[PDB]
């Protein structure tokens, strides 16, 4: 199956006093494995998954050094972008960065990507070919021209197509007991009387991994969206995820309705019926 390694960075300027708050997190698929918090006491990149603790002190030195350099770059960028947008020094502003790479079912490079944002809006994004940037406005246009004219412009592409893939493969092998294990959803249906003539059927999917899942209601074999409710997928806290979908049906007609569950861990989709 497909796999991904992604890094998320958030820098929030702190007018009034001090340096911006900087938080970085690293994911392999839906598993967080590293973090960095400027407000934490260690001032080190920290493990958040057991399989990354196998790495020696040289890895943690390298990751701490590079993540600190990234934080400094984002702090500089916060001041530069404040100047770009003619904003006052009194307000707080936020820069967000996500980049990563995907390997396909063939365990070879499939995709690379990087997106940068300012104050919750698109700023600049790498194109699919990894050879040029897309700028949302004129300030980002300035950044785009500077980056594309630079001698070291190629470095990010070389990272996404190469180094990123090699580290992802290494992480997948080291943490294969969990990273390459799919947890199929544990499903059940509940029934709640809403009135003398109507009832609510709720289809539960619990403790599944990865997060991607599709829950659908069908009436007599036809997809139904009316009179349904669908909560956002949420984390259980133990690394797995939860979701449910509900439908309001006439009392006595519950057998007409089926809940259909699609997930990576199911060889065939599940069908639940009351």
């Amino acid at each position: 199956g497909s796999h991904s390694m992604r890094y998320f960075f958030t820098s929030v300027s702190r007018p009034g006093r001090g340096e911006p708050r900087f938080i970085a997190v690293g994911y392999v698929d839906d598993t967080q494995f590293v973090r960095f918090d400027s407000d934490a006491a260690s001032q080190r990149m920290e493990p958040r998954a057991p399989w990354i603790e196998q790495e020696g002190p040289e890895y943690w030195d390298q990751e701490t050094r590079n993540v600190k350099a990234q934080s400094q770059t984002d702090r500089v960028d916060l001041g530069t972008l404040r100047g770009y947008y003619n904003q006052s020094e009194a307000g707080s502003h936020t820069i967000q960065i996500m980049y990563g790479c995907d390997v396909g079912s063939d365990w070879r490079f499939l995709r690379g990507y990087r997106q940068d944002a300012y104050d919750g809006k698109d700023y600049i994004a790498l194109k699919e070919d990894l050879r040029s940037w897309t700028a949302a406005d004129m300030a980002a246009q300035t950044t785009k021209h500077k980056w594309e004219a630079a001698h070291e412009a190629e470095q990010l592409r070389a990272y996404l197509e190469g180094t990123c893939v090699e580290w992802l493969r290494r992480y997948l092998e080291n943490g294969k007991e969990t990273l390459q294990r799919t947890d199929a959803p544990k499903t059940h249906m509940t029934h709640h009387a809403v009135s003398d003539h109507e009832a609510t059927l709720r289809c539960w999917a619990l403790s599944f991994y990865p997060a991607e899942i599709t829950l659908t209601w069908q009436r007599d074999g036809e997809d139904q969206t009316q009179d349904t409710e669908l909560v956002e997928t949420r984390p259980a806290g133990d690394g797995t995820f939860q979701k449910w979908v509900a439908v309001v049906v006439p009392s006595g007609q519950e057998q007409r309705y089926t809940c259909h569950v699609q997930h990576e861990g199911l060889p065939k989709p599940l069908t639940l019926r009351w």
Binding site: Y7, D77, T80, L81, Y123, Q155
Partner: peptide, 9 residues
């Protein structure tokens, strides 16, 4: 491992 050559905006 993270990217180590981000350029300033």
């Amino acid at each position: 491992a993270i990217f180590q050559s981000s350029m300033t905006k």
